[model samples]
Target: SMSVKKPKRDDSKDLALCSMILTEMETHEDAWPFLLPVNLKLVPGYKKVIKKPMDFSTIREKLSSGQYPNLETFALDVRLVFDNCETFNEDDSDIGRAGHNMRKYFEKKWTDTFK
Candidate 1:
């Protein structure tokens, strides 16, 4: 038998890293639109358009509760927030621009930390 390390990520370490990046996103000036779920009452039809709405607050809870099985899963949820925003808002709209900005920041952080 040959022993080979497959570079698997440690959950606890990845959790902390995920938490750190999430905090950065939460504090970002353009993070307002994504801090919480889109209010159904205020934004009617949002649920219809965004079937799986994701937000920083929701991600925080999921992370704290160990709902995410891996770092990749956590990353997907984060991107989901932005993807939903793009689906619902126009490119030049405030919320849409914010989504782009946040996604850009996350991509940079994810690459720098993991790759």
Candidate 2:
């Protein structure tokens, strides 16, 4: 009868390599959402207002004072913007189709498990 030897496993080295890979992969994967432009134009009357570039000074001031009213305001602004832009018409336009697809994608992603 021949005896079989089991392969040795380097737990520490394997763990370190896994940690590095996971960190890199997570950083890259996490940035995917930012990379995809949320084309709010799909919603009716959704115009991109480029009147002025974002003023971070107000945000900074709010943060400095520990008064984050702007955060809530921004959230409400987003909802209002969406509501104002969405078309209630039954007819589907290009923007409507795009919006529908985008929503479906988000729903699927949110419901799915990372693993």
lDDT of 2 by residue, 1-115 (tens): 2687688543434333333432332244322322233445663332444222222233234344545343334323223322332443222754444334433443343234121
Model 2 alpha-carbon miss at residue 109, Å = 0.1
What's the TM-score of every candidate structure? 0.90, 0.27
**Per-residue lDDT value at 43 in model 2:** 39
Clash pairs of candidate 1?
none
Candidate 1 stretches greater than 4 Å from native: 1-12
Report the number of clashing residue pairs per model: 0, 0
Q: Model 1's lDDT to the true fold?
A: 0.90
Q: How do the residues 4-110 of candidate 1 rate in per-residue lDDT, one tens digit apiece? A: 77885555578788889999999999999988878987888886777898899999999999899988999999999988888889999998899999999999999
